[PDB]
Design a protein around this nucleic acid. Structure first.
Ligand SMILES: [Cl-]
Ligand SMILES: [Cl-]
Ligand SMILES: [Mg+2]
Ligand SMILES: [Mg+2]
Ligand SMILES: [Mg+2]
Ligand SMILES: [Mg+2]
Ligand SMILES: [Mg+2]
Ligand SMILES: [Mg+2]
Ligand SMILES: [Mg+2]
Ligand SMILES: [Mg+2]
Ligand SMILES: [Mg+2]
Ligand SMILES: [Mg+2]
Ligand SMILES: [Mg+2]
Ligand SMILES: [Mg+2]
Ligand code: NA
Ligand code: NA
Ligand code: NA
Ligand code: NA
Ligand code: NA
Ligand code: NA
Ligand code: NA
Ligand code: NA
Ligand code: NA
Ligand code: NA
Ligand code: NA
Ligand code: NA
Ligand SMILES: [Sr+2]
Ligand SMILES: [Sr+2]
Ligand SMILES: [Sr+2]
Ligand SMILES: [Sr+2]
Ligand SMILES: [Sr+2]
Ligand SMILES: [Sr+2]
Ligand SMILES: [Sr+2]
Ligand SMILES: [Sr+2]
Ligand SMILES: [Sr+2]
Ligand SMILES: [Sr+2]
Ligand SMILES: [Sr+2]
Ligand SMILES: [Sr+2]
Ligand SMILES: [Sr+2]
Ligand SMILES: [Sr+2]
Ligand SMILES: [Sr+2]
Ligand SMILES: [Sr+2]
Ligand SMILES: [Sr+2]
Ligand SMILES: [Sr+2]
Ligand SMILES: [Sr+2]
Ligand SMILES: [Sr+2]
Ligand SMILES: [Sr+2]
Ligand SMILES: [Sr+2]
Ligand SMILES: [Sr+2]
Ligand SMILES: [Sr+2]
Ligand SMILES: [Sr+2]
Ligand SMILES: [Sr+2]
Ligand SMILES: [Sr+2]
Ligand SMILES: [Sr+2]
Ligand SMILES: [Sr+2]
Lengths: 82, 46, 56, 143, 81
RNA sequence: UAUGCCAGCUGGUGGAUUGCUCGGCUCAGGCGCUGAUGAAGGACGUGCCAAGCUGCGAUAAGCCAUGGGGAGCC
RNA sequence: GUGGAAGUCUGUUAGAGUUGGUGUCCUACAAUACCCUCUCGUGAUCUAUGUGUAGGGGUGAAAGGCCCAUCGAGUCCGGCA
RNA sequence: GUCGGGUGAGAACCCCGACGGCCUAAUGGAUAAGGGUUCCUCAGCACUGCUGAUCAGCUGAGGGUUAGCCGGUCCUAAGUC
RNA sequence: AGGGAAACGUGAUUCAACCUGGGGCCCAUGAAAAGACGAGCAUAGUGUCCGUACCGAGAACCGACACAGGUGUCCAUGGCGGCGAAAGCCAAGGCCUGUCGGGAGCAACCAACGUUAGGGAAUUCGGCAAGUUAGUCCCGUACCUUCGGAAGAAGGGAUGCC
RNA sequence: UGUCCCAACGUUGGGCCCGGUGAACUGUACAUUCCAGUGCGGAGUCUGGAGACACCCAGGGGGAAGCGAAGACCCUAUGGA
């Protein structure tokens, strides 16, 4: 378990009206990588969803501090806002 | 629309004819309802 | 307005209906005349020699 | 589990739009067994099924504007969109004025201040649009 | 000569009408009137008919909803057939 | 030696071919009117389960009589 | 000043229509469609249903227009191989 | 649309919640014509569905339309027999 | 009575519906019939027959289709806005089915579209396309004219908030 | 005033790669062509040379006198209207 700061500047690569969506993806990929786990095993707590969609589908925050934990036999992660 | 009593009887009959060939008729004849109609795909008379 | 597809949408009038006399859906409910058997027009049944080849 | 039918019954029993009925997430199983309307009312009392509140537009910002305007503000040239006669109907305004002038003249007469003949002269002049307002009429009466 | 009563119409909705409203439901000849349905029912089960509502069904038949008097008991009537 | 060409082998696909015929086509002989005593035709019903065909008509794949027939039938 | 006329004006009110883009489409969403622009919008107005006029005949403020995707003579079958 | 969750052998698109959105003469409510059971329930996914499908206007089986006072029914219109 | 968890209001303005009047127009004159009223009251009995589901449309209708087309009526008084049944935003209500998704800062090229220095129609058959102007108030307004008009001519100024 | 000088950068949807779904047009045969010539005088296929290792992706369309339609022009028919 640790606190990490995820940069979401790469969402700008996707069309503007769909940034929120790409954000939620970048977040899952970042945790999967930095916690050495499969993306399928990463669980994003709704708190994170709401943070990214706060300004609608086109206005994503440039970064987001997220608190994630790693455990269990198969290896999974649980993440949330902070 | 407004259906008369007679129109209604005919519509009902058509609905009944729209059933399947009973399973036993299958065994007995040892192996289709050629008149199977659909309300949308088809058009009834009148 | 085209005579084709767009003009087909206006068609919701009932004309030809099941005929009391012959059972065909040819009784014109506006004319009250069957185009198939002649009901409403003649006591005799509608018939014509041109409904078949001349020598048959 | 599929609760769309239950949503329809709930909207009816709660007398609200389907979009406002709320089903407790932790009780999908019980709501799913709800077959009858009675089963629905039962769950309603249990609070497992509730009706979200409907909104009403706030009129606060409108009320402030109404005040400023009733006080004569926020109606400068830059705030008008309609033609003058559209902002105030002229025939309608004349009806207001002429009636007020005739009521005035009618009161002065029964009161004794005006003789039926002085009243006539003024009444006919009012009808000819001689006075801009009641005050204008009074000012004239005072010679 | 066609008969008035064809057979009891037995369905969930029919039973409710029987347990809760003292009503019996019948499939009847569609040429029969409400009055002819009342008479026939009284003569067949020796009961007193109070009201009869009819409906020409999408099965090509006529359904009748016969309410008996408080003197009779639908549940018990239908239960003897 | 990949992509691939030609012929064949095993297996498909397809339904030709051969064989078969409850259907046709044509000829010949016999026969020949029905209906208000409501015909022909149609509609809707009618079966334990019954959608189609056939039959039948609220007595609804059937009722009665006489003769035939026969240990099966629905 | 009053009054409120008008085959009157503005108007994507409803509603009717369609100047240009020679835009989009052109094995289409569509055998006549889509978008913007554009015209009419109290009248010779628009519109629903009912009803009448039938083929060398209708109907036509006339374009040989229209009479069920068909018209300088409809459609079907027959004449007919 | 997205995040969680539900059901299921199987879930991007079947259901719940949250967050995010779309429609305001309509993408809402009642209806005429026309359609004809498409309505409701249960069980299903070979068929139909611009992908998938546990879903459905699809398949199987049942069920559903209750009137003295709402229509028809009555009257007559252009006009028809 | 009913309904509501509860309270279970009182006044006012503007007033669709509905009611009732006044005026004007016609080389145009705006149905008929059944029926009803006229013509009281009690109690009782009778009131049969047919329709009744559902869709009513970017999937239930017509268009071969779950077709961006076509298809009548009433909801024309929900809030802000403003002249407004206009735009834009928002309720009630409906929907995420104008139903395939995943991925590449996602190249060329195409469809829609934003911004372009200086020049300013040189482009082109042609200013085609795009743009310029714009609402409201004040000032002011030519030729011509059938005296109606031309006219919003043109041109000039103003516009928020407190 | 990006119509133009003279084009640039950006936005959204496609285009490209991946999963699933999955047509049509067209097809005498052969076919890697190019330059000349020849030929019914407008040849990928004949002749002479030149060039040419096979396969695949993307592209804009030079050629196949490309595909689509038994030329709507013209003439001819002891044709039609
Ligand atoms: Cl009705
Ligand atoms: Cl008055
Ligand atoms: Mg059924
Ligand atoms: Mg289900
Ligand atoms: Mg005036
Ligand atoms: Mg009834
Ligand atoms: Mg008409
Ligand atoms: Mg669709
Ligand atoms: Mg520039
Ligand atoms: Mg030039
Ligand atoms: Mg222009
Ligand atoms: Mg030719
Ligand atoms: Mg010629
Ligand atoms: Mg000639
Ligand atoms: Na149909
Ligand atoms: Na029955
Ligand atoms: Na004979
Ligand atoms: Na059968
Ligand atoms: Na005057
Ligand atoms: Na145009
Ligand atoms: Na002719
Ligand atoms: Na308003
Ligand atoms: Na889908
Ligand atoms: Na430009
Ligand atoms: Na080419
Ligand atoms: Na000709
Ligand atoms: Sr259809
Ligand atoms: Sr026209
Ligand atoms: Sr159209
Ligand atoms: Sr019509
Ligand atoms: Sr006749
Ligand atoms: Sr004859
Ligand atoms: Sr049934
Ligand atoms: Sr006008
Ligand atoms: Sr106008
Ligand atoms: Sr043009
Ligand atoms: Sr344009
Ligand atoms: Sr075209
Ligand atoms: Sr007006
Ligand atoms: Sr035509
Ligand atoms: Sr012929
Ligand atoms: Sr399967
Ligand atoms: Sr349904
Ligand atoms: Sr008033
Ligand atoms: Sr209803
Ligand atoms: Sr509706
Ligand atoms: Sr539509
Ligand atoms: Sr809402
Ligand atoms: Sr789908
Ligand atoms: Sr800028
Ligand atoms: Sr020029
Ligand atoms: Sr020039
Ligand atoms: Sr100015
Ligand atoms: Sr050679
Ligand atoms: Sr290409």
């Amino acid at each position: 378990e640790r606190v990490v700061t995820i940069p979401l500047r790469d969402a700008r690569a996707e069309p503007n009206h769909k940034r929120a969506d790409k954000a939620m993806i970048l977040i899952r990929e970042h945790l999967a990588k930095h916690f050495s786990v499969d993306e399928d095993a990463v669980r994003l707590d709704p708190s994170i969803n709401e943070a990214a969609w706060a300004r609608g589908r086109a206005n994503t925050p440039s970064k987001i501090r997220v608190r994630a934990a790693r455990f269990e036999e198969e290896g999974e992660a649980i993440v949330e806002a902070e | 629309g407004k259906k008369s009593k007679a129109t209604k009887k005919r519509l009902a009959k058509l609905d009944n004819q729209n059933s399947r060939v009973p399973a036993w008729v299958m065994l007995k004849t040892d192996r289709r309802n050629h008149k199977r109609r659909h309300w949308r795909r088809n058009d009834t008379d009148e | 307005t085209g005579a084709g597809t767009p003009s087909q949408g206006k068609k919701n009038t009932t004309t030809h209906t099941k005929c009391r006399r012959c059972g065909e859906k040819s009784y014109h409910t506006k004319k009250k005349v069957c185009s198939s058997c002649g009901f409403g027009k003649s006591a005799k049944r509608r018939d014509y020699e041109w409904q078949s080849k001349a020598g048959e | 589990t599929d609760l769309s039918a239950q949503k329809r019954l709930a909207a009816d029993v709660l007398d609200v739009g389907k979009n406002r009925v709320w089903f407790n997430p932790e009780r999908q199983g019980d709501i799913a067994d709800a077959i009858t309307r009675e089963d629905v009312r039962e769950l309603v009392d249990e609070g497992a099924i509730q009706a979200k509140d409907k909104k009403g537009n706030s009129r606060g910002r409108a009320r402030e504007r109404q005040k400023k305007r009733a006080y004569g503000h926020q109606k400068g040239a830059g705030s008008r969109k309609g033609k003058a006669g559209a902002r105030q109907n002229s025939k309608e305004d004349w009806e207001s004025r002429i009636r007020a002038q005739r009521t005035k003249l009618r009161e002065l007469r029964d009161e004794g201040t005006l003789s039926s003949s002085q009243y006539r002269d003024l009444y006919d002049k009012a009808g000819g649009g001689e006075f801009d307002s009641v005050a204008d009429l009074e000012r004239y009466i005072d010679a | 000569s066609w008969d008035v009563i064809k057979h009891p119409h037995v369905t969930e909705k029919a039973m409710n009408d029987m347990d809760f409203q003292n009503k019996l439901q019948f499939a009847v000849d569609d040429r029969a009137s409400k009055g002819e349905v009342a008479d026939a029912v009284e003569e067949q089960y020796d009961v007193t008919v109070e009201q009869v509502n009819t409906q020409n069904t999408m099965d090509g038949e006529k359904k009748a909803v016969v309410r008996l008097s408080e003197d009779d008991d639908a549940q018990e009537v239908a239960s003897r057939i």
